[PDB]
């Protein structure tokens, strides 16, 4: 399950579909009036994501917005091509917009340098904390969840099966990780942001979480169980809470390391 690998797309719940690679989540949120894609995966992933969207019976021209969680290569590397293939506008937290436009991280990014750059992307605009993105019957809410990056966004919406509507959360990474030459200890406002974000995430309404790294909420296990139990298997409203706590533990572990 490498970040750029192939992966048979599947429905997670209702009009929420997985269209990413084997190691990184991307989600298509489909409607008759156009689709929203969350994240583009790697630069070569763009090949894969675009195949899937079509493998599920959808056109790329119907993709109107690409939402970014955050601007590291493994989630955002493919965004540029998908923009080109779809013609979509790319949406991102203000602080990551330049990194998507240019391909190159700011010095303030903990993985400046350690993550080599990626292809800069056309048609990028910022979203604000709380902003509601509408596309026909679709409504996706941005939540600022900075820390791992300054412009990190967690995205939420609702999908319905047989009249049962669930709150779906595409959770940004909340992990304190960086280049070797970077210390969270010397960046206490970065630390406060991470802490703010744990809180925000563990408070979201969260029936179904899809983590940017899909194993962070057991995607492939859930998918296995879903062959049996249907898409119930993806539903677990403790999931965002779980994610936040692993992030918060990971910040303890990391600040320790540093001393
Ligand atoms: C470094 C990445 C974010 S870009 C991350 O959070 N990963 C990478 C693999 C698992 C997961 C984690 O540490 O929880
Ligand atoms: Na973002
Ligand atoms: Na929806
Ligand atoms: Zn990252
Ligand atoms: Zn990542």
């Amino acid at each position: 399950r490498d970040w750029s690998s192939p992966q048979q797309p599947f429905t997670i719940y209702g009009n929420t579909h997985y269209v990413g690679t084997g190691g990184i989540s991307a989600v298509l949120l489909s409607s008759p009036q156009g689709h929203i894609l969350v994240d583009g995966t790697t630069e070569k992933g763009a090949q894969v994501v675009a195949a899937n969207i079509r493998a599920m019976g959808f056109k790329l021209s119907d993709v109107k917005y690409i939402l970014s969680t955050h601007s590291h290569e493994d989630h955002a590397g493919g965004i540029s091509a998908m923009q080109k293939l779809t013609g979509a506008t790319v949406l991102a937290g203000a602080a990551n917009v330049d990194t998507l436009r240019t391909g190159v991280s700011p010095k303030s990014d903990p993985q400046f340098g350690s993550l080599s750059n990626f292809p800069g992307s056309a048609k990028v605009r910022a979203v604000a904390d709380g902003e509601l993105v509408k596309l026909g019957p679709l409504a996706v809410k941005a939540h600022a969840t900075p820390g791992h990056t300054e412009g990190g966004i967690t995205w939420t919406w609702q999908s319905c099966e047989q009249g049962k509507c669930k709150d779906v959360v595409f959770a940004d990474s909340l992990t304190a990780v960086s280049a070797d030459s970077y210390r969270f200890s010397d960046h206490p406002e970065v630390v406060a942001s991470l802490r703010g974000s744990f809180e925000a995430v563990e408070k979201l309404s969260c029936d179904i979480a899809i983590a940017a790294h899909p194993e962070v909420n057991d995607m492939w296990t859930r998918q296995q169980r879903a062959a049996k139990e249907g898409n119930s298997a993806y539903v677990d409203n403790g999931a965002c809470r779980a994610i936040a706590a692993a992030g918060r533990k990971r910040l303890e572990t990391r600040l320790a390391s540093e001393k």
Side-chain angles (χ1 to χ4, degrees):
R1 291 188 174 285
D2 297 351
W3 299 344
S4 204
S5 81
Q7 174 59 71
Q8 170 68 46
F10 55 103
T11 303
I12 295 201
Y13 199 79
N15 66 147
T16 298
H17 315 283
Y18 191 104
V19 295
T21 62
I24 301 283
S25 302
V27 154
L28 190 88
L29 185 69
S30 69
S31 89
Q33 298 193 55
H35 318 310
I36 291 163
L37 174 66
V38 188
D39 276 348
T41 205
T42 69
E43 178 195 30
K44 292 169 289 125
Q47 298 346 113
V48 180
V49 170
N52 303 353
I53 292 163
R54 288 220 197 77
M56 297 294 279
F58 295 122
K59 313 140 132 88
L60 296 188
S61 64
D62 288 318
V63 178
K64 305 304 184 189
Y65 290 119
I66 304 185
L67 316 183
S68 165
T69 52
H70 73 267
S71 47
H72 291 170
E73 61 185 344
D74 60 329
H75 311 287
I79 286 184
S80 188
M82 293 305 320
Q83 196 293 318
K84 277 189 274 272
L85 300 172
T86 59
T89 299
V90 187
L91 307 186
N96 289 351
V97 157
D98 288 338
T99 303
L100 296 177
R101 277 178 177 136
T102 74
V104 52
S105 275
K107 296 160 163 70
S108 52
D109 202 86
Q111 298 187 26
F112 183 76
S114 88
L115 292 212
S116 185
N117 307 285
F118 60 81
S121 167
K123 307 219 74 224
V124 191
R125 78 140 163 109
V127 291
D129 192 28
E131 181 169 339
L132 194 56
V133 186
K134 312 185 151 281
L135 184 70
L138 302 180
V140 185
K141 192 183 183 167
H143 303 266
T145 54
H148 178 95
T149 65
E150 202 182 328
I153 300 277
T154 295
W155 300 99
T156 59
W157 66 91
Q158 171 178 274
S159 297
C160 306
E161 293 205 342
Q162 306 297 17
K164 315 300 195 164
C165 296
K166 304 291 197 205
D167 287 302
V168 180
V169 180
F170 196 112
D172 200 12
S173 318
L174 303 174
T175 46
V177 285
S178 62
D180 290 59
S181 53
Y182 182 100
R183 288 174 64 74
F184 283 89
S185 279
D186 306 358
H187 296 280
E189 280 296 289
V190 166
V191 173
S193 283
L194 273 176
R195 284 195 214 288
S197 290
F198 306 147
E199 260 192 61
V201 180
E202 72 206 348
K203 290 173 186 230
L204 295 166
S205 308
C206 180
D207 290 309
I208 301 178
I210 303 132
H213 292 281
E215 79 283 345
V216 174
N217 190 34
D218 271 12
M219 178 59 73
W220 306 114
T221 291
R222 288 169 191 289
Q223 187 194 28
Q224 284 296 284
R225 289 210 188 279
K228 195 73 147 63
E229 309 147 13
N231 294 344
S232 285
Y234 301 106
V235 180
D236 175 5
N237 67 348
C240 291
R241 281 191 298 274
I243 280 169
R248 200 185 272 113
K249 189 177 147 194
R250 183 65 153 285
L251 183 57
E252 298 322 307
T253 307
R254 171 46 133 94
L255 290 175
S257 294
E258 287 184 357
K259 293 166 209 301

